[PDB]
Amino acid sequence: MKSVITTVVSAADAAGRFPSNSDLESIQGNIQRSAARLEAAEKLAGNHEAVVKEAGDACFAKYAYLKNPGEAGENQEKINKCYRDVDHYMRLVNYCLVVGGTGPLDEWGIAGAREVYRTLNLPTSAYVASIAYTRDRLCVPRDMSAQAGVEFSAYLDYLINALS
């Protein structure tokens, strides 16, 4: 779990020393910024069924061929599977917004995604299209405060970069 605390205590463990004030300073950094980053969590927590709604259909509209025979979206419950599979990524960005680091994302959704998406022939461009849809769908002032929108987008484009 890549978190602000797990970095500093693992460093202290490797050096074999007690936590110094340079370590405590980072948790102070958490103390300030949780309030801004926790606001986005609740926003995504409640409104999560609507964002996957708009994201999956945007994915399928941008690549209409994917419903053709022999492609990933050839029947019904595969489309339902797709919508589930983006629901998972929304869940993981919520978890990462809570922990403070990219801990949950890079070991539960990113780690090993490349095998599943290549052997099951799932184009990653379709995932990144749906994610980039929500990246700009959001307007920072109305939906959230100013700084929750920054950090939500910073977590979203993290996995955008990771999948590309």
Partner: protein
């Protein structure tokens, strides 16, 4: 043994938390969690391969050595699995001179330099008697490996301070370059080929290039040449009330 630059001008070494969990009643070691294990393997790749810029087509063949490693935390067996792979041999055994491969093993798996000609001879005899895997097994199961790194840390270039011989220090710095220095600059042609068999030392500039930051590297060089003259017989006197005596 003081390491005036081991843990203050250089970071601490990296590896498994501790060997007590190896005693294993319910688990073999505290699940370092997958996110503090991928950086361990990233660290090992940067060491045993030494910045070889390995693509993922070539990291699709080290899957089996990795998959056992995260399951059973011995580091030493992980590097034993790595050094016998085609990824290790194709880079370090294929295009290279013999003592080049032998000397690269000291950099990769032991983190020091060969201290003498007889060590190289012993490795050569040990290779000739049936394989190179015997070379790696001798190094890895060595005493020196147990009392330096063990089954917990990545093998790293440790500044010991209390070297058994000084040329060991020189030849540690020449094999270890700077960062963004790899091991296919020369096409074979080991750097210590001449200096091991002859007994002289290495270039001062290339040793100074590998020193850590803030160590007044390179300075103090008199402008005349650097290698000493074995045949010199200088007279240096002491100081006595009556005169000077050349107690030689």
């Amino acid at each position: 043994a003081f390491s005036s630059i081991q843990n203050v001008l250089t970071d601490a070494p990296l590896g498994t938390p501790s060997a007590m969990g190896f005693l294993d009643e319910r688990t073999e070691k505290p699940l370092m969690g997958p996110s503090e294990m991928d950086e361990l393997v990233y660290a090992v790749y940067k060491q045993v391969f030494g910045n070889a810029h390995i693509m993922e087509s070539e990291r699709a063949e080290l899957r089996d050595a990795e998959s056992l490693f995260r399951y059973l935390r011995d580091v030493r067996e992980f590097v034993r699995a790595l050094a016998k792979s085609n990824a290790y041999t194709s880079r370090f055994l294929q295009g290279n001179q013999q003592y080049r491969f032998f000397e690269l093993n000291f950099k990769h798996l032991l983190g020091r330099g060969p201290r003498s000609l007889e060590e190289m001879a012993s490795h050569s005899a040990l290779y000739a008697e049936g394989g190179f895997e015997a070379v790696i097994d001798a190094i890895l199961d060595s005493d020196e490996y147990a009392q330096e790194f063990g089954s917990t840390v990545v093998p790293y270039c440790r500044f010991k301070g209390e070297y058994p011989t000084n040329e060991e220090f020189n030849r540690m710095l020449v094999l270890k370059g700077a960062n963004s220095t790899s091991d296919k600059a020369g096409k074979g042609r080991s750097k210590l080929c001449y200096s091991i068999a002859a007994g002289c030392s290495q270039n001062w500039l290339s040793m100074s290039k590998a020193l850590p930051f803030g160590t007044e590297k390179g300075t103090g060089f008199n402008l005349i040449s650097s290698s000493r003259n074995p045949a010199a017989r200088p007279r240096i006197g002491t100081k006595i009330p009556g005169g000077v005596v050349f107690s030689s």
